[PDB]
Amino acid sequence: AVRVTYVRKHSYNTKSNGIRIVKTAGGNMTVQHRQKISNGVRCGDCGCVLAGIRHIRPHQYGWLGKSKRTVTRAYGGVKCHKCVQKKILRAFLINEHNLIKLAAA
Amino acid sequence: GRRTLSQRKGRGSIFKSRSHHKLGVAQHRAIDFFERHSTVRGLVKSIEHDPGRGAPLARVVFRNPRQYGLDKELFICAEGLYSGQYIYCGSKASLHIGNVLPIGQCPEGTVVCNVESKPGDRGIIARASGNYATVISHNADNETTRIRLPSGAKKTLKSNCRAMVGIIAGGGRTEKPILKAGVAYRMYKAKRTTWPRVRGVAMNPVDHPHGGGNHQHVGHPTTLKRSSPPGQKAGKVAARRTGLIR
Amino acid sequence: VFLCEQKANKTMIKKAVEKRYGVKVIKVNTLVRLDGLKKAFVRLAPDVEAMEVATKIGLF
Amino acid sequence: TGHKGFSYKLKLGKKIHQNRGVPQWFRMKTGNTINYNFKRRHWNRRKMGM
Amino acid sequence: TKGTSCRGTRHNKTHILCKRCGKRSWHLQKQRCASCGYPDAKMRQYAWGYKALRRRTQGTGRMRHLKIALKR
RNA sequence: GAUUCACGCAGUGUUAACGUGCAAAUUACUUGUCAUAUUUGAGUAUAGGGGCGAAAGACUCAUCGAACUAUCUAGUAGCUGG
RNA sequence: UGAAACUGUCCUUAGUGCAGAUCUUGGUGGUAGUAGCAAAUACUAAGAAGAGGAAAAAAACAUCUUAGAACUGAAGAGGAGAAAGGUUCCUAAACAACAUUACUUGGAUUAGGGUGAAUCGAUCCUAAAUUACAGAUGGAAAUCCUUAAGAAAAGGAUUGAAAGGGAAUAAGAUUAAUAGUUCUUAAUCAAGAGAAAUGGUAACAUAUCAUGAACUUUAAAAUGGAGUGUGAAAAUCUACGGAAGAGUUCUCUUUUCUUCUUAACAAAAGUAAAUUCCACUGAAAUGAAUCAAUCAGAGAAGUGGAAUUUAUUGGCUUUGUAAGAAAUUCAAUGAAUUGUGGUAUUUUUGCAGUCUUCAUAAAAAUUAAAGGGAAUCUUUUGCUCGUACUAAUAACCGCAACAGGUCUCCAAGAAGCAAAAUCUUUAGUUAAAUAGAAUAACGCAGGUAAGGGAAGUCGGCAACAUAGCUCUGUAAGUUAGCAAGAAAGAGUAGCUCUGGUGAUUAUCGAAUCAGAACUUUAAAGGUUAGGGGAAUCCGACUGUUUAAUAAAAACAUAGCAUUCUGAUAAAUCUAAAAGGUUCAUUACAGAAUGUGAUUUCUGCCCAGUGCUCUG
RNA sequence: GGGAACGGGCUUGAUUGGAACGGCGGGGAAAGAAGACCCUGUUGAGCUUGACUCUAAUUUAUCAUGUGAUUUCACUCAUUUCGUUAAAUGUUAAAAAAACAUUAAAGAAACAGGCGAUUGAAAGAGAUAGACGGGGAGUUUGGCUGG
RNA sequence: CUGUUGCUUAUAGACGAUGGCAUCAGAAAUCGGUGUUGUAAGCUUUAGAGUUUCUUAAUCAAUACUCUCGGGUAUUGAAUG
RNA sequence: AAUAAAAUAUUACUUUGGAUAGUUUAGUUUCCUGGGCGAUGAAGAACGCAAUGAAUUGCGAUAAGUGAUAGGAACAAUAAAAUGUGAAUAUCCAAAAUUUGAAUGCUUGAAAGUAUACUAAGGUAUAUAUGAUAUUCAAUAUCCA
Known part of the structure; x- marks a missing residue:
């Protein structure tokens, strides 16, 4: 039952002041500063969390590999696979429907 | 005597509007050529809850007709609108629910809301939840139309005043009886600091004109003139009638 | 360990000690005392012996 | 306090x-x-009122 | 509890030292100095405060650049 | 915006202690309350015929049926003392 | 006595004669060696230093070490911070004054010493709000405006948080005192310098890889609370196998106790829980599923995959770090070891759906991606400021070493429903406004009592009494929810047993329930722990109130009702103002009032005074 | 006993040894406080009101010269109130689909002396004059008197 | 002569005072009497419901039998020596 | 009836206290002369500098003082050094003059800071209003080709 103390000068249990107590040599328990939980990317159309992109802080994506922050697809990384399939059908079917309605139908 | 609580309200120190989480200003987009001689199409992206008001607000996203990019407005939801809907605004718009047309194009008996009291001011009349205004008649001689205000009064407006077809959502809001003082406390979470109202007769003569003596009463008529100075104007002002109605 | 003017930074102290005594400095830590004097902890390169500089200056 | 401005500490030191x-x-x-x-x-x- | 007990929570400064007069008279929330009349360019002096005039005025300091001028 | 216990909080009673006190309002038991009309830190806003008040003329630095402070001012006294 | 100025007479001049003014200032008596130095369980023995325990017991003796006995009892009298304090921190000399005795002690005197950052914060961003040039207003000081008025600022100025957002550091050791700051070791971050890809059907995946300008969009930073289930770690408890040391040992005890550890950052043997998608196929005799739910032909269950989260890489074990550290022992610097589990509790931390709102629960700095097609490993540096100490029954505010007040973090065992009362462990302390003797009255605090039982008294004021859990049982009245723990009755201990509630194919594990003999001092009661009933009045209820004599029937409240207003309005602040508040508003709204839940009912009067009129 | 009508001191008597300890609460008309109940001041303050005298806000009439036919009309030209990225004003020529829309190939009409509406010579501010005006300011509320 | 002082003095007592003894002073244990409570610790009674474990020995087991009218306390404001 | 411990009375000496007497480098009033500040940075505030200084005094990174001119042998609490080849002392002089302050590149809470141009560091300039001149512009505002 080793009781610990805050290492930094913050004395209040705010969200940015998260701590985890880990063990060390001789039964010593120290204080670790744990990070905050961050949300992931969402499809711009349906607002669903995309798959294949991690949930980390915005600056941490700079440290990520260039291929580990986006999905190799048209509108990948900003739209779900369903968000894009409807886009293709909308872009194609509407173009075909008016190709026979006007201009000397 | 002191200054009555009504006088202290015009100062605006603790009686300011608690508008921090409010979404913005709900009004029509600025009138231009495309809203005067053509139609623009808007896409209802989402419907949200604006604190301090009983009606939902819709985030409509019009494309910019003159430049490249979007143009995001904040309309008031007519009852029936849904996400992903297309709404058309202009002098040639279809007469569907949610479309915005000049008040001079709607036929007689059409129900509209968010009416402009002057062309280009983007919404004055019929804005509360469940409210609407009806079109009474047209006068093509001076291009003016008559509409019936939700209070029952009749008004004359120019035919160029835009309006949104339908009724405002969130109807029947006030039909639910508040049960607890806590529920009334939470009603003004995004409103002024006016809820717990102390009766004037319960105060002292310094604070209020009704501050009574050994028996809680008024002692003088509570129907006053409109010309009464601030501080003594309390109760009923320019009242033509009183009592209960049979 | 030195006492320097407060209006000098770690960069100017590092050059000043290098020029004044002809030594190599790899680390400087400074604290400003309550009276107003800035105390500088100057660490020399491992090749240069600090004990000989102290005797040369006059500390020994 | 543990945290103080630079000017405040020098005026603290002079009082010493x-x-x-x-x-x-x-x-x-x-x-x-x-x-x-x-x-x-x-x-x-x-107390020195500062 | 308006006497001894209510004094326990007094640990928030209202006035700090001012830059133009050096007194602990700079109001933090009002952003003005009660004594020397800070950012207001004219020094704060009043006729009813005649003693306040004889405590900080000309001749109460070093007079570094005016002692020579009048002597000259 | 149910019933209670606990960390805390208040102040119903003893009209107990104390009453040149631990204290210019505190102590002990008892009682009530002990999370949504809740408790609380910091920042910030509101100033004297003004502010703030779930309203007691309550609170506004131990000062309130009109704060503190300086000037008019050695205010006036058919009244009291010398 | 005193050691350098002074006196008498006449005129002149006046700040010219004191017993009083609750007179002003200063000094001093009786009271008086009197009242007091009585909250916070507590000290004793030996030794050391010291002038400072002597003696006809002068019954007491400050400080330090050891031993005994103890208290705070881990929501602490423990270990650390924010504000406030400002050198109070450490050491040495020294004790005139101060800490209601004394002091060798001290937060007290004297003199030195002490606060080390690329990674912790300020610095950066904006929130409520705040302040400038020009402009508007004013007799005036000055006020208004904060992007509207401007030849000012691709777009909107300044400040505003050491608890909001935020690039990057950990372990061990060291000092009389500093340490995510120094030393060793091990990392991390930023700014530099030296026609343009594959794979998978797909969800999607590739040590930087695999070009991507203007312009635009999206996402992140970035968002309430409750309650339920569960993954993981830590703490506690426990099973198995030992190693080392300690305690007990005349009565036993294969016994009781202590240690058996591991960081940042990365790696990928082995292997989890939950959610969402993808491919095959097409569900009815409808299935699938949770504690609850909930889902399906715009497609279920089944099989096979993909992705994300799980306190750093990738959650857990494991690995590099790294045993060389550290811990426990042994010897005189050198040697020994450092398995594996659990269908237990708590805390922390995420996740999954459910409920709730006339409440919907911030923004910017900064970053990434997309649409688009313009153009053709090594090494260097990382500046300024804060950093000591208390954070309180002695460092803060109250005149003080004041029983008052002041925001937080970490948190063991027993017992119990319980973070309750009570006792103990690690840590801290034995002093915190003086003691000894005697054991009078009157007191303050805690008690008991024969017989009676409110006869006392304004008044059951004060005290007594009931009290946990289980089973039975429970009235009138009622807004049909309650009253209700109504009221009332029975049981409860110890020892020895029996049965029920599961997992895996006989073993393994959990406290919980029920039952039966036997025994006794016949069992909730050491602590904790509701007195009950029958009515009347007021307020409907939860709530607030005269800080310091009134906590209530007073205020508030939801409900009911009335009045004005189409917004250039109504109310209303300002001397004025392209001024200000409700108003980021628009009659289901704003403003001004009376009554006070629900049920029932609101009677008659317009003469008078108000208010109003389309007259 | 008398006395200011309830003496510790005075008069006449009763009676007295100097210093005091622990109690207690009769007295010292005990201490604390220039009575707070009552009255008198030609002393005040809060509050109320058709008390007297006034005042902010409100309101009404006249004045302050926009043009063309005191009132009635039409216009805009000061003025009122607004809207924007002052982003197509005026006159001629000519609801099936929550997707994209930009940096042009080889085009995208001209002119008005008005940025767009709105109000309009009316309203608002100023001067003078009447009304209203406890919202507010100043002041007053005689004397004699078996209190 | 008297007082202080001693018996941590009593028939007394807030403190003084008062009462007793002071070398045959006094105090102390121990011993016996006299009281209070209720049968001590150790081994035995298979006391003993029962479960274990040999196999019909043991072990554990509230409570209960003998030693036991036991053990403990007893002036401190008791009484002999 | 009795003693004087206490109590009271006078004198002398001592004590607590600081009246009285003597004294003044301090004030008050009147009069005479001036009434001489600052963007060439004032008054005011802060910090710092003596061989041993805490205050005060003087001074400003050239520090209880530098140069020049007069001045002639000191200072002192204790040491040192320098000194008629010039010690103290004096001045309408010269050089120098930290952070701020009307405070003025921008910000300023107790805020540490920071942008550009000129001559890594250091030093200057850059606020608002404003008069004159030069220069670059804007407006079909009036004409005019």
């Missing part, structure tokens, strides 16, 4: 400097009436 007494050699000057420093204070006796 001025909390001293007359040196012995000064008291031995001819025609000397200065034996004590009447501008003296102690942390538990008087």
Whole structure:
């Protein structure tokens, strides 16, 4: 039952002041500063969390590999696979429907 | 005597509007050529809850007709609108629910809301939840139309005043009886600091004109003139009638 | 360990000690005392012996 | 406090400097009436209002 | 509890030292100095405060650059 | 915006202690309350015929049926003392 | 006595004669060696230093070490911070004054010493709000405006948080005192310098890889609370196998106790829980599923995959770090070891759906991606400021070493429903406004009592009494929810047993329930722990109130009702103002009032005074 | 006993040894406080009101010269109130689909002396004059008197 | 002669005072009497419901039998020596 | 009836206290002369500098003082050094003059800071209003080709 103390000068249990107590040599328990939980990317159309992109802080994506922050697809990384399939059908079917309605139908 | 609580309200120190989480200003987009001689199409992206008001607000996203990019407005939801809907605004718009047309194009008996009291001011009349205004008649001689205000009064407006077809959502809001003082406390979470109202007769003569003596009463008529100075104007002002109605 | 003017930074102290005594400095830590004097902890390169500089200056 | 501005600490340090007494050699000057420093204070006796 | 007990929570400064007069009279929330009349360019002096005039005025300081001018 | 216990909080009773006190309002038991009309830190806003008040003329630095401070001012006294 | 100025007479001049003014200032008596130095369980023995325990017991003796006995009892009298304090921190000399005795002690005197950052914060961003040039207003000081008025600022100025957002550091050791700051070791971050890809059907995946300008969009930073289930770690408890040391040992005890550890950052043997998608196929005799739910032909269950989260890489074990550290022992610097589990509790931390709102629960700095197609490993540096100490029954505010007040973090065992009362462990302390003797009255605090039982008294004021859990049982009245723990009755201990509630194919594990003999001092009661009933009045209820004599029937409240207003309005602040508040508003709204839940009912009067009129 | 009508001191008597300890609560008309109940001041303050005298806000009439036919009309030209990225004003020529829309190939009409509406010579501010005006300011509320 | 002082003095007592003894002073244990409570610790009664474990020995087991009218306390404001 | 411990009375000496007497480098009033500040940075505030200084005094990174001119042998609490080849002392002089302050590149809470141009560091300039001149512009505002 080793009781610990805050290492930094913050004395209040705010969200940015998260701590985890880990063990060390001789039964010593120290204080670790744990990070905050961050949300992931969402499809711009349906607002669903995309798959294949991690949930980390915005600056941490700079440290990520260039291929580990986006999905190799048209509108990948900003739209779900369903968000894009409807886009293709909308872009194609509407173009075909008016190709026979006007201009000397 | 002191200054009555009504006088202290015009100062605006603790009686300011608690508008921090409010979404913005709900009004029509600025009138231009495309809203005067053509139609623009808007896409209802989402419907949200604006604190301090009983009606939902819709985030409509019009494309910019003159430049490249979007143009995001904040309309008031007519009852029936849904996400992903297309709404058309202009002098040639279809007469569907949610479309915005000049008040001079709607036929007689059409129900509209968010009416402009002057062309280009983007919404004055019929804005509360469940409210609407009806079109009474047209006068093509001076291009003016008559509409019936939700209070029952009749008004004359120019035919160029835009309006949104339908009724405002969130109807029947006030039909639910508040049960607890806590529920009334939470009603003004995004409103002024006016809820717990102390009766004037319960105060002292310094604070209020009704501050009574050994028996809680008024002692003088509570129907006053409109010309009464601030501080003594309390109760009923320019009242033509009183009592209960049979 | 030195006492320097407060209006000098770690960069100017590092050059000043290098020029004044002809030594190599790899680390400087400074604290400003309550009276107003800035105390500088100057660490020399491992090749240069600090004990000989102290005797040369006059500390020994 | 543990945290203080740079100017505030220097004015704190001067208050430490001025909390001293007359040196012995000064008291031995001819025609000397200065034996004590009447501008003296102690942390538990008087707060310096700063 | 308006006497001894209510004094326990007094640990928030209202006035700090001012830059133009050096007194602890700079109001933090009002952003003005009660004594020397800060950012207001004119020094704060009043006829009813005649003693306040004889405590800080010309001749109460070193007079570094005016002692020579009048002597000259 | 149910019933209670606990960390805390208040102040119903003893009209107990104390009453040149631990204290210019505190202590002990008892009682009530002990999370949504809740408790609380910091920042910030509101100033004297003004502010703030779930309203007691309550609170506004131990000062309130009109704060503190300086000037008019050695205010006036058919009244009291010398 | 005193050691350098002074006196008498006449005129002149006046700040010219004191017993009083609750007179002003200063000094001093009786009271008086009197009242007091009585909250916070507590000290004793030996030794050392010291002038400072002597003596006809002068019954007491400050400080330090050891031993005994103890208290705070881990929501602490423990270990650390924010504000406030400002050198109070450490050491040495020294004790005139101060800490209601004394002091060798001290937060007290004297003199030195002490606060080390690329990674912790300020610095950076904006929130409520705040302040400038030009402009508007004013007799005036000055006020208004904060992007509207401007030839000012691709777009909107300044400040505003050491608890909001935020690039990057950990372990061990060291000092009389500093340490995510120094030393060793091990990392991390930023700014530099030296026609343009594959794979998978797909969800999607590739040590930087695999070009991507203007312009635009999206996402992140970035968002309430409750309650339920569960993954993981830590703490506690426990099973198995030992190693080392300690305690007990005349009565036993294969016994009781202590240690058996591991960081940042990365790696990928082995292997989890939950959610969402993808491919095959097409569900009815409808299935699938949770504690609850909930889902399906715009497609279920089944099989096979993909992705994300799980306190750093990738959650857990494991690995590099790294045993060389550290811990426990042994010897005189050198040697020994450092398995594996659990269908237990708590805390922390995420996740999954459910409920709730006339409440919907911030923004910017900064970053990434997309649409688009313009153009053709090594090494260097990382500046300024804060950093000591208390954070309180002695460092803060109250005149003080004041029983008052002041925001937080970490948190063991027993017992119990319980973070309750009570006792103990690690840590801290034995002093915190003086003691000894005697054991009078009157007191303050805690008690008991024969017989009676409110006869006392304004008044059951004060005290007594009931009290946990289980089973039975429970009235009138009622807004049909309650009253209700109504009221009332029975049981409860110890020892020895029996049975029920599961997992895996006989073993393994959990406290919980029920039952039966036997025994006794016949069992909730050491602590904790509701007195009950029958009515009347007021307020409907939860709530607030005269800080310091009134906590209530007073205020508030939801409900009911009335009045004005189409917004250039109504109310209303300002001397004025392209001024200000409700108003980021628009009659289901704003403003001004009376009554006070629900049920029932609101009677008659317009003469008078108000208010109003389309007259 | 008398006395200011309830003496510790005075008069006449009763009676007295100097210093005091622990109690207690009769007295010292005990201490604390220039009575707070009552009255008198040609002393005040809060509050109320058709008390007297006034005042902010409100309101009404006249004045302050926009043009063309005191009132009635039409216009805009000061003025009122608004809207924007002052982003197509005026006159001629000519609801099936929550997707994209930009940096042009080889085009995208001209002119008005008005940025767009709105109000409009009316309203608002100023001067003078009447009304209203406890919202507010100043002041007053005689004397004699078996209190 | 008297007082202080001693018996941590009593028939007394807030403190003084008062009462007793002071070398045959006094105090102390121990011993016996006299009281209070209720049968001590150790081994035995298979006391003993029962479960274990040999196999019909043991072990554990509230409570209960003998030693036991036991053990403990007893002036401190008791009484002999 | 009795003693004087206490109580009271006078004198002398001592004590606590600081009246009285003597004294003044301090004030008050009147009068005479001036009434001489600052963007060439004032008054005011802060910090710092003496061989041993805490205050005060003087001074400003050239620090209880530098140069020049007069001045002639000191200072002192204790040491040192320098000194008629010039010690103290004096001045309408010269050089120098930290952070701020009307404070003025921008910000300023107790804020540490920071942008550009000129001559890594250091030093200057850059606020608002404003008069004159030069220069670059804007407006079909009036004409005019």
